[PDB]
Amino acid sequence: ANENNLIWIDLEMTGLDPERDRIIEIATLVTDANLNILAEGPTIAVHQSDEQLALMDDWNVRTHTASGLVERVKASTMGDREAELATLEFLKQWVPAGKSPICGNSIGQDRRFLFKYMPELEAYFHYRYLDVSTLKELARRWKPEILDGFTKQGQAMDDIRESVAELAYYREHFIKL
Amino acid sequence: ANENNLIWIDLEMTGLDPERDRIIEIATLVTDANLNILAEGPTIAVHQSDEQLALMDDWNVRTHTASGLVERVKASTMGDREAELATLEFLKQWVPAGKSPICGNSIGQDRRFLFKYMPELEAYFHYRYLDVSTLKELARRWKPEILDGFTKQAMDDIRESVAELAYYREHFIKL
Ligand SMILES: [Mg+2]
Ligand SMILES: [Mg+2]
Ligand code: NA
């Protein structure tokens, strides 16, 4: 455990509305304060009912079926609470409660789903947000030149590792240390 | 009107839980892409019931009573919907729909209340977030030296947030 470590997280959901939609995937990963990847946490397909999956709009059915996530959700024996507790069992080994901001890309949406469906995991984070896309937005406005230099190869944890590498790029090319 | 303008916003709430708590203040302000303040929007006390105000924990009762916001809430004839529409009437003059990220300090909480209580104003923002406190967090971890150089009413908070982002632009970003 170290109080400067960062919790990175990436959810998949059935849609964008926490009131109607559910979490169907959680992945976590911990870095040190300098973005050295310490440990990859468990990628868990979160079981939801056939009823709930049938409410998915066409974009979500297409994406989550093609990826194999829909199959893994149907087969999963872990609901919201089991996935929450397994994620906490992983994070407790690496980061104390209330210290890491929520880190990732478009993490405001993810935190909304944590508040509704995994409030204990939500509480484990510092109140603050580290959305890498905050730096992409500023870069696009103040220094667009640097955006040509970074590329994504287009898997939850591939997205997290890409988010870490993206923050590291902004640390070298956008920040002044 | 200009596609590169930024919407800055600060809500006050009765508490932290959108399921139980309500918006009691909205303030907005628009900057250009380089943080030049173009216009201060309306600061509106959002009417909520005496029942709802009575659910406030000690921190919220102390803060919102002392500021005079509780008096203004009781006197207000603008609910969620009227405050939403008045805010949109101001923002339409300055920024097209779907262009500005939500800008401010600890703004994820505010957006949660927009989703529940002002979904039309929420939709007016780009899906993205510009939380200045994201840069404060990185600064604290990567360059704490610069935090001693900067030191800190809804709109005072927003103007302070703009000045804070401007500080990080000079002392933390490399242009
Ligand atoms: Mg994502
Ligand atoms: Mg505030
Ligand atoms: Na928290």
Numbering used by the authors:
A (entry chain D): 3 to 156, 159 to 181
B (entry chain C): 3 to 154, 159 to 181
Sentences from the paper on this structure:
In order to obtain better understanding of the additional C-terminal helix, α10, in Ms_orn, the structure of Orn of Escherichia coli (Eco_orn) with the canonical Rnase-H fold was also determined for comparative structural analysis. The final structure of Eco_orn could be traced from residues 2 to 181 of the polypeptide chain. Eco_orn was also identified as a dimer by gel filtration, SEC–MALLS and PISA. Superposition of Eco_orn structure over Ms_orn indicates overall structural similarity with rmsd of 1.134 Å across 347 Cα-atoms of the dimer but lacking the C-terminal tail of Ms_orn. Eco_orn, on the other hand, buries only 17.2% of total solvent-accessible area comprising nearly 1650 Å2 in the dimer interface. The nature and position of residues forming H-bonds at the interface is similar in both proteins. Interestingly, estimated Tm (50 °C) of Eco_orn (which naturally lacks the C-terminal extended region) was similar to that of Ms_ornΔC, suggesting α10 aids the higher observed thermostability of Ms_orn (under mild denaturing conditions). The denaturation curve of Eco_orn shows a monophasic manner of transition from folded to unfolded state, whereas both mycobacterial proteins exhibit a biphasic transition. Quantum yield of ANS fluorescence for Eco_orn at its native state in the absence of Gdm-HCl, on the other hand, itself is two-fold higher than that of its fully denatured state, suggesting that native Eco_orn has partially exposed hydrophobic surfaces, whereas Ms_orn is more tightly packed. Once again, Eco_orn, naturally lacking the C-terminal extended region, appears to follow a different unfolding pattern from Ms_orn when monitored by either changes in λmax of intrinsic fluorescence or [θ]222 nm, suggesting that the unfolding pathways of Ms_orn with the extended C-terminal tail are different from other Orns.
Oligoribonucleases (Orns) are highly conserved DnaQ-fold 3′-5′ exoribonucleases that have been found to carry out the last step of cyclic-di-GMP (c-di-GMP) degradation, that is, pGpG to GMP in several bacteria. Orns are highly conserved DnaQ-fold 3′-5' exoribonucleases with a DEDDh active site motif that degrade short 2- to 5-mer oligoribonucleotides in 3′-5' direction and release monoribonucleotides as reaction products. Removal of pGpG is critical for c-di-GMP homeostasis, as excess uncleaved pGpG can have feedback inhibition on phosphodiesterases, thereby perturbing cellular signaling pathways regulated by c-di-GMP. Removal of pGpG is important to maintain the pool of free nucleotides inside the cell and to prevent mispriming of transcripts and is brought about by Orns.
